[PDB]
Amino acid sequence: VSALGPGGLTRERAGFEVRDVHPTHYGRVCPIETPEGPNIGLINSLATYARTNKYGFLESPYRVVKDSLVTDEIVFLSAIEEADHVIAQASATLNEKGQLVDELVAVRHLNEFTVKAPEDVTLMDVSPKQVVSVAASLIPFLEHDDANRALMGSNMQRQAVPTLRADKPLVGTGMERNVARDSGVCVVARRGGVIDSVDASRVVVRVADDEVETGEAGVDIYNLTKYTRSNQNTCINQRPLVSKGDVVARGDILADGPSTDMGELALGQNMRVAFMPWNGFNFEDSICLSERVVQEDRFTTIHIQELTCVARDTKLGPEEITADIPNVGEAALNKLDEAGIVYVGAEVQAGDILVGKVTPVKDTSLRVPTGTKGTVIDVQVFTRDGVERDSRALSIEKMQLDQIRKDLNEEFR
Amino acid sequence: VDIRNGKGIVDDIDHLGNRRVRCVGEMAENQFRVGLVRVERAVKERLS
Amino acid sequence: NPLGVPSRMNVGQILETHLGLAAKGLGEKINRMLEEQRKVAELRKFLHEIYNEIGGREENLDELGDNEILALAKNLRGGVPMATPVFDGAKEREIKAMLKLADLPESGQMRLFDGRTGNQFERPTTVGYMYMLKLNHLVDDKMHAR
Amino acid sequence: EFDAIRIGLASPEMIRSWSFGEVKKPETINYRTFKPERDGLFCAKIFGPVKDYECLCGKYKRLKHRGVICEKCGVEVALAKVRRERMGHIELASPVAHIWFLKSLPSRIGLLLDMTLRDIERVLYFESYVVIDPGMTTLEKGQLLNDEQYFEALEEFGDDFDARMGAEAVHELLNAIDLEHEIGRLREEIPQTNSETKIKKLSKRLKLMEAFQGSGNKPEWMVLTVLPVLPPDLRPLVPLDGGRFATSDLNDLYRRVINRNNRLKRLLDLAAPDIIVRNEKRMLQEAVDALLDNGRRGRAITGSNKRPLKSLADMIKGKQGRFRQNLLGKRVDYSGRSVITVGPTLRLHQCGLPKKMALELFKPFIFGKLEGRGMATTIKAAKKMVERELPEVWDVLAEVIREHPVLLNRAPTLHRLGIQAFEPVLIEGKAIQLHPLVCAAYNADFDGDQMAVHVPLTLEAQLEARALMMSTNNILSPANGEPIIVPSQDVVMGLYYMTREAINAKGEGMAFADLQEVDRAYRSGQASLHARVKVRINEKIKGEDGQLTANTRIVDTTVGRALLFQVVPAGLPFDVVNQSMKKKAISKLINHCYRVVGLKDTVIFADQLMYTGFAYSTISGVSIGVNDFVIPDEKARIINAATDEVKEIESQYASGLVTQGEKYNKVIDLWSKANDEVSKAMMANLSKEKVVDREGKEVDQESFNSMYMMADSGARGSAAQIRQLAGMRGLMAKPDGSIIETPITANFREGLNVLQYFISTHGARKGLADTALKTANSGYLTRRLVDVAQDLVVTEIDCGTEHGLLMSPHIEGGDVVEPLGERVLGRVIARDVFKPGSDEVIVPAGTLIDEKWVDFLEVMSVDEVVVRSPITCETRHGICAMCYGRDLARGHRVNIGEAVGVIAAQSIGEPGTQLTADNVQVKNGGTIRLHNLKHVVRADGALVAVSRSGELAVADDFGRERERYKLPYGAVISVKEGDKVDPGAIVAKWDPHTHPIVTEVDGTVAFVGMEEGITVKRQTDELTGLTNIEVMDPKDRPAAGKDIRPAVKLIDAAGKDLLLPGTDVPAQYFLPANALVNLTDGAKVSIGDVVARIPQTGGLPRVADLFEARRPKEPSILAEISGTISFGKETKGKRRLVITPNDGSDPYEELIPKWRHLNVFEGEQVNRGEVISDGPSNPHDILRLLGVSSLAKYIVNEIQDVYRLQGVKINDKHIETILRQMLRKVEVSESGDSSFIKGDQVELTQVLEENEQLGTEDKFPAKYERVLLGITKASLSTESFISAASFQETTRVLTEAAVTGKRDFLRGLKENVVVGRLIPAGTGLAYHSERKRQRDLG
């Protein structure tokens, strides 16, 4: 939830009123999750249980209580409606029947924190987690961190990178299950059943006859997305976590995506640390790492980046994607194909010629930027309507229809 | 006038009640209404 | 650096480190119990002992012996994960009892041995398994030169 | 070479001279053939050839005729660079007014015509006529006529009245000014009118007219009949990839102007109707205005974008406002950056450098060495080797790196220390390794910081890097002589842990023959690091200069202290290392070592200290654990007690006995007391939480708990943070600032609840939001500070003056805030210094006070000394090297060419980010002394002092004043001058509670005009609380009682009239409303009896206010001239208190409105310096009444209070330097050689007066009054226009320079920076001096 944009406060109109938290933010907007910098407090995040009202306002859940006991019924209440009710903290003494046995419990009548006698309390909180955001709810022992470092930790955890092999946190807040499931990175069984066949690329599920229509009983083909460039140039791949023949229910996790460990959220990796000054190598905030952490390859990450070439309608003529680049050396041409494009799966050093374009004959051939070295994993070709489809596009298409044909062949089978 | 005289209290922008949260639907509808009013004016000019 | 704890007044690192040490100790204990070819009854009672201590509620005895309990042990051999919620999480004494249950020092500290001179440090330091992150601020993208 | 860049109006003839053609076609390039068209915005006829040494047709392609223009190709063949100098012109059908000389806040074109900008705008926008050449007619030249009015005037007259419209009319007005006649008439009429406003306006008129007359500028040039066009490369169209073209805003604006001009000519040539013609003229005026500037009147917009077009004014303004990003910023070559990394194996003078960064940066050096060694023949081979990274290229890279320092700086460089030279060492990686000890100076932690690296090239640059900005050179901070390269957190922890003591430890007791035996025993493991042992040592003391005496002594110490002493150089005693070695102790040790041993041994000592600190912090496995935060056991009891108390108070409030407002204060005080008690108990438990056995009976010792070490050592953390970590967090503030009624009882070890966390979030959000604004304000403040104090560089050696500021220890309150030693250390004495008995010279003359001199002054009882200050040193254009004392970054006196102004500004602005009553009770026992007290003894010896200026001091036994207090008016004091008063005594028993009126004379008073109901009211309080009479208010009185005021006529006990000394009139003080006159009229009142009794921010904004010399909303009212004060007539609504000095009566006195309370009592000495009504002082009144030194002391103390609140120490030299820069201008009262009132530099007036003394007459010398200008005002008012134009308000200063015809001799720092010359300070001083020698002397 941001405050900038059209009809919104600009960073030059900040002041202090918008950039401070108020007792009305409790359970509606996270108090500790905001970006540190020029726009602090202007951009916030909704709380875990936050809810938009019918008229557009924010609402948070609460439990209605009577004089004697705490009633189970739960009502969503917005900021205006909190004045009459005295709201109790999510933690309070209970007599095993809902009766607050304490003498003075922490409450707030009119946004004024104070103690009150249980006989006058009218509403009770739902969860202590409903105050912080989803990002802030993932910090273990958040109650032992000051709000500055909690803010920094939430914003930091927001910026992690998926490592080669995800490792679930040994100590978490249990909210990792929820954030992993609610995001779409994990392949979730839309209908329960028994897994028919599994491999690194797809999952096929025999849908239970009970949870199926009359005809076409078992059809649920889950195509896992393999290594795919994200918006931040990080890899996005999903791995199966189910074998053949095991029964699955509606909502189970068949494949876990990036930064996930069998349905949990696994951003980083847990490792044995010691808190001691070691020869001044961890001086101000530095970290000193054993060579095992590199040998075990724990924090390595995969970065996918793309490079493009466009065939412009140059004034003299159209430029063609041809391998006969003028004044081209042999080894570089050997790395290339006949159509002028690098074969998929070729190690590329700096300055090598990935794609060959001749523009009238001058060369617009794509080469990798300096300092950039990697392995080619995929090549995509788009051709304008009414233009000749090159051989590589033909091969890519025939592979795609072969895959499609085999998918419906086994689905029919 | 009553607020000036002392009856009642002035509103403060701190309350999340005095603010409201939009979403993709609301401003998407606003942009659609802007385009619709432009098209409507053009049509009224043409279909007169 | 221990010096970053007292100034930036956050104790979550220390408590997380202690609980992670307990988690890895439990994982190692479970792994060594699995390697000794212990029967499913012993595994079940140890898991129940882990899951009856302080908080939550034990959910076992609803799992088949050979399949589910052995799969649980094979998944916990790398460390038993504890879920400590935001403000209703693990107290100090629960972590202490977990540590004393895992045959680790109740204080969470023991004297380490130096890696070069090989002589024990005079005072005991804090060691444990902390969930460390890697951020998208790599020096590979920051190193520029002209 | 060149100098003295001029600014003036552009003449149409000179505009033609500038141009190389007449741009006539709006379009730029043909879509078919891609060459610029004839008469277009890029035409080759006008601006030059597209290709270097080529023509349009290719008739001549040879590189021989570089100036010949071909026959078919009129486009002269020349180099392609010429497209940057060649400009064109556009001939406008009608003249158009210049936007800058129109819309500037003082409108120059309006001022030159004595007509308001509104009327001119009416004429320009074709709304009303104006009259030219009135002739013999009723109409006047300044008269504006409407359509009907002009039609009637034309019908009535018919001729002899030229009325026009538009900028053509303004142009016709301007060239008929006759500046000589106007100047003469306005000078004749200047003194005729006595109105201050009118005289000011006519003075501005005179200034403009004389500026135009002298500057060779013509008034008609303001309205440009022809305007230039920028060369094409400075307004380029950068083609977008894909064949698109990106057109600059300048091209769009030029095209618009050209189109409208072409429309104008082709609609006048066919005689279009008058209305459309005038509309077209208006459009052309608007288009030229938008081209020159935008947003002033019309705010022109672009196509399909809400972003306004960028005009030339915004172009010359630069990015980042007016701070020129191209002429001052100027991205450089041979540079790179990366994340920084701590290197603990680095010596202080060197820094790690990645292989790839070093190889890329030093590429030309590598090529040169490769060619010199012959390993490469062609540069292609050299590039191949350097890109292949052949093994032999690393050798040559090492050779080029060996003695070539590099520059490292952080992103925000708040002071010179933020960029230092390092001697690079090749490392394996991609990060820049930094020395741990330079992080404090850089303010750079290793949490993700990046550093830019720059490679100096010239031998001058390398030598300047090695000799001025090498990391070893700058150990001491330029802001204060205290060191800045000092052990930080981890090394401080190591050194502190090493030098501790344990009551019982392994190895305690035996004696060691040397430090070597101590090391041998410790490394063998037979002795603890901190065990009380005995060891004999060989310390070499430097007590005598030139004689290093070595003595052997046995000292009781610990093993760790003996080990650390093996690091200490050979000029310091062992007693300097025998304590616990906290951070402050280590910093003082380094400071002492620098001033005793030297610099090279000091950097060696610092490196060794860092090495041992790291080594022994690694050896000590110190760590933070959950058990380290020791919660005091009494915290629970204290919290329960406070909870019981607050429950009782809440019940009482529920009963209604206690008000909510008082309950709030009571509960907050209770909770604060409980928090303080809990914190004290926690600290007392933690500090001594060690029980040890000493061969039997248990004992206590200082704690070895890790968090306690981290606090006590000062390595990292503070008591305020342990208060949160192991004690209750205490009260927290709501966003409105009100402290929440309930505190946070839990700590971070116990963990906070949800509500307590939410409150701590209130606090943390407030702080974090405040941080960014603090940084922005600090950056702006330091930018203004630098731009106001840049021309100030030490030039002379000894100016010769003997004026300075009396410096005394700052004793505001009961304690000494700053000892005299710290204030005058590094300064220079202005006059003789005497013993307590005079005639004995202690410090003779301007001897630079050093450590020896400050110790000598402390040994004697010197209390007040006078030192030479930069506010003194009346030298011209600079400051003498004495009055600016010892340099702070160096141990010696400053050297000629040091830009102390920029250092001062950086010193003040760097720590900005760290920013955001009855009686006297003597503290300690001392002989009481009186200063500035004027009071006569009472009847019994009470000695009531009614004078407002007065203070009470308790001088120590030696003679120095240990404490001073401000004695208010009407204070009864048991005068015991010379008699020691015990501590805690109440010598002065003042209790004003009111404004008492003393009665210096005695006798039976005659209260004349005391009317019971009209002037007074015998109102007695309940229970006979007062047997007195209450004075009737002037308005509450009757119609006749309003004008009647009570008067206690002075009579003796028998009826003899008495009068106060100095004035014949009696001291019959009137009794105003709300008075308390208990003494009966006619009763003998003793001398000094009370007659009439009348009852009565901080951070970056405050320092900015002091540096701008602003006026608050309600300034403190001050007395004007000392003398006999009077009573203010409240009937008129403003109190008029006439002053009648005894030396000479001056009846002039202003009237102060009664809207603000006035605490002035009539019938006393005015004391011009003193204050009439309370409030924050206005820096000015202090300057113009008290003087300059008084203003200096006030401003310095006010800024230093703000800085000392956060504990940042800044020397006063810098604040005084900025003050000197602000007080650089003076205003003249009686000129005789200049204008009556003018803001002229004090140097100019001094030079004029000195020349006039030995000149025509003797009375030609002028009298002037010093004036104070804020930094943002003093910087913009410099003689140089280039310096001001690149600071702020570029348009205003540029127009002012244009009309005034200013000349800028490049004699400042920014002038040479922007023009690319050597700095007039530092090492460029020699070059500038030689240039002056060759220029001024022929």
Add this chain to the structure above:
Amino acid sequence: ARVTVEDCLDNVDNRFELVMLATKRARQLATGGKEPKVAWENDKPTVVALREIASGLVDENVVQQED
């Protein structure tokens, strides 16, 4: 040893003419127009020029006479 920027700048007490005349001497040395008054210990021209300043073997008068 190292360039004595501490004691040499103290004798002349200006530290800026030190840099100026050191650069003069270093340019003479790179041009080969004079001999190092101090025996080379494998340093580059700037450092050896500075140690010649420190040892007092070369001065402004000596460099000018050599010039």
Add this chain to the structure above:
RNA sequence: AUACCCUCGA
């Protein structure tokens, strides 16, 4: 290889 907008780090 020009200007805005967004996001992020110190």
